[PDB]
Write a protein that binds this ligand. Sequence first.
Ligand SMILES: C[As](C)(=O)[O-]
Ligand SMILES: [Zn+2]
Ligand SMILES: [Zn+2]
Ligand SMILES: [Zn+2]
Ligand SMILES: [Zn+2]
Lengths: 244, 244, 244, 210, 228, 228, 228
Amino acid sequence: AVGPFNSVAEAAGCVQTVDWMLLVLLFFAVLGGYHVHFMLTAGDWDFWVDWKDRRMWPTVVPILGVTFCAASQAFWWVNFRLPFGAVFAALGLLIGEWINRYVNFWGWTYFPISLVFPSALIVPAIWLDVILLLSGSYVITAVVGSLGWGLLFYPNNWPAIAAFHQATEQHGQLMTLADLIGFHFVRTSMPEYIRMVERGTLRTFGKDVVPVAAFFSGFVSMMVYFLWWFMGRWYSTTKVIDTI
Amino acid sequence: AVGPFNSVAEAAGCVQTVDWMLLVLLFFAVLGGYHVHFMLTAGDWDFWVDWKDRRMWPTVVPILGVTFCAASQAFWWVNFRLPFGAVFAALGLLIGEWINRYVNFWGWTYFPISLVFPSALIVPAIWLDVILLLSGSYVITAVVGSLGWGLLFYPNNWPAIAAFHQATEQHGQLMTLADLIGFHFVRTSMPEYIRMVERGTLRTFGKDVVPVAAFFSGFVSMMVYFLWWFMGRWYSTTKVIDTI
Amino acid sequence: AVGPFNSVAEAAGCVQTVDWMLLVLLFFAVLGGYHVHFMLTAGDWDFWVDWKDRRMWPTVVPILGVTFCAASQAFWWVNFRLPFGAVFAALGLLIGEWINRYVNFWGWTYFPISLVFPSALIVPAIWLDVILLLSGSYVITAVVGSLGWGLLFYPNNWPAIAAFHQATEQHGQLMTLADLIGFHFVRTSMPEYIRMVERGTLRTFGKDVVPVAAFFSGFVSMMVYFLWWFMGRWYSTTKVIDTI
Amino acid sequence: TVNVNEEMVLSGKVHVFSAWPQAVANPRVSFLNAGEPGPVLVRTAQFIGEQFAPRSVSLEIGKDYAFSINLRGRRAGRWHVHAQINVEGGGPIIGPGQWIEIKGDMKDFTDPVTLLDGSTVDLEHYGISRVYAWHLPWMAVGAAWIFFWFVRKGIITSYIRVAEGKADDVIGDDDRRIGAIVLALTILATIVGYAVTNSTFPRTIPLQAG
Amino acid sequence: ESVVDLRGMWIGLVLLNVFYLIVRIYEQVFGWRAGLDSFAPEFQTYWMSILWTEIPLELVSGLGLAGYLWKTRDRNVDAVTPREEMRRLVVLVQWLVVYGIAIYWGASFFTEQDGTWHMTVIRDTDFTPSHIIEFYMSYPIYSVIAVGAFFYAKTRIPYFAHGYSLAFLIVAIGPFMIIPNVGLNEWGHTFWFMEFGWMALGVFGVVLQILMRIHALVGKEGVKLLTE
Amino acid sequence: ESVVDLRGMWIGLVLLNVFYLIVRIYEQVFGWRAGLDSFAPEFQTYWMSILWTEIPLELVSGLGLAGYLWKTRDRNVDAVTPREEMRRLVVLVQWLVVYGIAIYWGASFFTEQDGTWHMTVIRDTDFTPSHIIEFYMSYPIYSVIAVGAFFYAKTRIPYFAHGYSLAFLIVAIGPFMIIPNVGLNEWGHTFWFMEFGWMALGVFGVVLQILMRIHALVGKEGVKLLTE
Amino acid sequence: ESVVDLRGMWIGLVLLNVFYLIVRIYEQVFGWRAGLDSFAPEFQTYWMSILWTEIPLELVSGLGLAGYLWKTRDRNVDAVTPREEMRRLVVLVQWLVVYGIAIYWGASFFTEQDGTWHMTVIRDTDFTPSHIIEFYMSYPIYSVIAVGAFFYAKTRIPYFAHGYSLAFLIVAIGPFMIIPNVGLNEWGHTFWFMEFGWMALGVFGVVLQILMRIHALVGKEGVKLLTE
Ligand SMILES: C[As](C)(=O)[O-]
Ligand SMILES: [Zn+2]
Ligand SMILES: [Zn+2]
Ligand SMILES: [Zn+2]
Ligand SMILES: [Zn+2]
């Protein structure tokens, strides 16, 4: 008489095993979707250490990266009030990347990890979640959430990256280690000139190349957020339809 | 007998004459619309034998061409269950082109038909209608219908076109007959260099120039189709409104 | 007298003072928003006498300028049946421009008004309002309204502009006064070559540069108008929602 | 034929044909490369038109140019290695390729390279440690954040709470206080993580390109 | 009396295919050598004349047919009898078959005819012999029948009176949003540097709406029973 | 007592046009020679000071007005009387007339002012003398009145309490979506290679919603009868 | 009996991670030297074989699963008991965890794997070793599980029968709209001159729809009471 479970152990028992199934099928799910999307647009800067520049990369990755996090948020927090939306997505990605970076970029083709390591996301991802957890509003999240997410990108990457931004002298020319790493480990289709990285303009004043890039990246992410929040909604639709 | 008809002969009699009127007013209708749209975007490849190449033309014409066919389908098949949607539109176009090709391109300005003859559409148009006739679903149609439509384009054009793809030696250079036809019959505004045709890339491997082109042309037509199906729906709207 | 007012003089008295505040808070409002948008897109032509040409300027300004007029119209006329929608927005802009033109372009930096004066909008704005006033229809307004609006722009700017379109000989070269005014009063960031003005084409026949420009500008405004009408509608939404 | 670490060199000359096809962009902007399955050989340095060419370069139409690529061996095997040049708006142009044969063990491959400050580093290994060291913590952290709340209010549970009136049964401080704490720590760990990797390597320059 | 009339329809078709046929011949004859150079005076006599005539004429033609239909509108429309409505519909369906033909000439024949004339001249202004017909003839006409059909339905059928079918509204109005397209599409490069598709098959809805009204004015008897 | 107060409105308008008029003047004076080269130290004293002050001041001014209005919210709003609502609305219309002027200054004056300063320097960084005022002053202010208006309504008018008018919500939140526009519009070319309009006349809705409440809080008596 | 089964789930997971693990290894071994030049005949034995096999196999695999489930559909679905439904759902949640894994392999592993292979060859045609697996293997499979899931729910759960969840419909069909994306994304430059994002987290809806069913098939008792 616990129907349509026979016992409470059967109820609480099933509920528990189902919970896991969901969380797991839902892990990828997103990881799978998020990855394919991210990879097709953010690429590319996330493959190559000699792309991770000062202007482009700290711009495009936050703006393209905020997407599934914002849709993921609109699903957990709306329907379960669970404050791990962004982090659930962001991490899902990071794993799916890393595994493949290792197993394949390295383990299959033997580009060394120092070349093919992914961009760091989890700090911003946490930052986002906690703006939504504290203020219950996605509208606040979209503003101070996505701004934060924008700023923390480069800061939270600096620890991994700085290492390869050390100078080396090479036939009487300067290079960074990264420049060189890419130069060494021959990519059959990756000529510098394709890079999509900072190469300098007359309009740069300062001594600001990164500040402005991370600001811009936050202010835009505000929009990408709103749009992706509501897409996280349509995507949550329990609508049923009549014909196909 | 059958009010507000006096006899059955008056009913069955009127009904019949109205039916003709409809089918006819509805023939063009679409032809008119379809033509102006098609001719503005697909041009141009459909005018000139020396535009009908291996890559562009077998790409853009299926993609632009599927539009009114899908919208036509969403009208006949939804509302009357009549399996001639695509063919109804495609043929309407083909008449409206041909007439003009002859009477004007030729009979007014005297470019010879071998230069000005239209792209063949009816095979793919049939194939489309029969995917919707067989599976009753426009979702299936949108996938295997529009893929089919894309592939058949070039194959059903080859019978007409091959003729002019024969080689001629011209002051110690090669031309096709078409190249030459275009060269001969002087167009006051048609320099080779405007053409928008295959001119070769380092990225071509094979021996595949057309297969990829006709595949790409199918895959994209899938999306064109969905969008155009639903527009075929808004276009069929019996909504009435309050003010202008 | 009439609750929740104590007297009629309290009612009619308040009603009156509110009316003003609305009309006022609503003046800018639009002016503020319209201006920022207008200035971000139509720049630039509206700043510089040497930008005001025969093709671009009389094209882009009608086209960008109709926007907030249409949205304004959709607001006054739908909800109050007040026929001053376009004018209300156009003038707002005109003031908000002018003031700043004087007080700053001049009074702060000292470029002489002859260089910095704005494009004339009110004649077209009137015309619009009256096409809506006469035919009660925003469909008809959207057509003959926005056609008129495009045509009149240049005609109603000619009185102001002609003056500077006079010729001066300058080191054995021709300039218009405007060309010169711009040349004289140095703009630290305004090289001719940035201009975005008429420079000539082989495709000009006549003796028509402005007529076509102003027709084109009218025709396109018809669509801008529709879109901006309905945006004036969504913007007027009294809808209230549950969560943020 | 080469040993792992053995410094072979491929070199030659090439003529930029004159009736350069419309099909391919102007070689105004190009890049010299060695056509090999992955980095089976590292590239130590390379030169074209009498210059160090680790970046993009111009070729004029109708001239000839001379080039060479220093290739330290790395991967055990038999690899058909081509001289190769790519063009801006064009693609790869593949040249002569010859079977080269490496022997030894990849295990033994090193470079290394010399920093401006003085020291030496094996590129085949340098930095890889720090990456993991900063990434994998954070990845665990993220996965911790998830596990925590998943076992603290179920999916079904919390969906049903949200579903009936409430909600607020699911969240509500000190759920918030957890957040504020975890958040504050995170900003801190980052401030720290930044300040440290700022002391380690206080040199640093932007990627060199153009 | 009878429902189906058709007399009306034929007068339109006959009067039309003729006028266009005259034209196609007139342009066959004076296109070639009278309209090849606009700076000549035989252009003014044979083309610039037609232009100056048709526009004002069409413009009046249109407002003509409009006023008339409104004027002769059935002021007591809702009263209409099942036979008279059915008759009226059949006339509506008639207007649409002329609209049909008008659409063909304007939007297919004289439109893709223009294509070939662009390979024949270098253009003295935007007024070619082809444009005079395409733009300022065959389109205006087709647009005027469009409005006619719209207004007839509106002032004769209770459904189209007290409404505006959005479908028919579209059909009657988008002809004024083809110039933005087919016209400006030509001043592509000239009007360029300073920088899918919206169409008129609104006729779908309009015939569907008509169809529903027929299905209504036949009892269960005619309906189910006569046509199973 | 009386519905119409206005005393509050004047305080804002007066306190405002004054603070902007001071600044205009102070920028007249110290713009010209003191803020012409950023590398100088008289820039730090005359501009780079203003910046460092206003932001934290603004940021606190904002959370202040916010907390206060919430705090002093009418806890039993639904109970509110017809007169006291009517009065409360007139206070809201007031906030909106100040929001009005803030919008003027922040979005037209100090915004198109920046236009002419771009013709005057070559920029030492993004912090000009014009940006200090436009971006980090005239906007934040106009944004903070915006918020005020929003929270006042919310905590005084039953309608805006238990709700969020979408219109008002927009009004109060799109100011944090102009930086994406007006700002990044500037880093056009520099931020470029790696690659209609969303606006705030949401006030339309907001005044429309206010209007409906008034129309309510006058009986058929005042309504039909007094204003026919 | 019992609701939760899981036996079915394990068979899929186990059968799957194994088949992908075999392949990863087989591509480790024959990728390197057997699939480096397409014009060789060891390509035909080691890659061009797999291709020619899988497609027809997959294509039949898919129509197989499909017909079977429809065939063995519960013809009297609405009658289903609260326990049996609950059991059925748990099987549905099962299909979705395998769909989950399928998605992982097809869309993350074998997809970003292709990235690195593009740094290794120059491509003899579009058929690399990576494409045989990515496109014509790991995707189709993941697409077929997707179809399975969809059809199972349709033929076992009253909700998904007499319906089409639009959410599930999406999930089951958008896999045939990734080729347009992930595929043609590659023929970027070659197919170029002649010239945000539509995605599949439709699972959201689907699991939400499942959730509502569970929340139903537990009385006020289990619901409120057991899980407060
Ligand atoms: C599958 As049934 C006809 O019982 O809804
Ligand atoms: Zn009536
Ligand atoms: Zn500025
Ligand atoms: Zn049923
Ligand atoms: Zn690939």
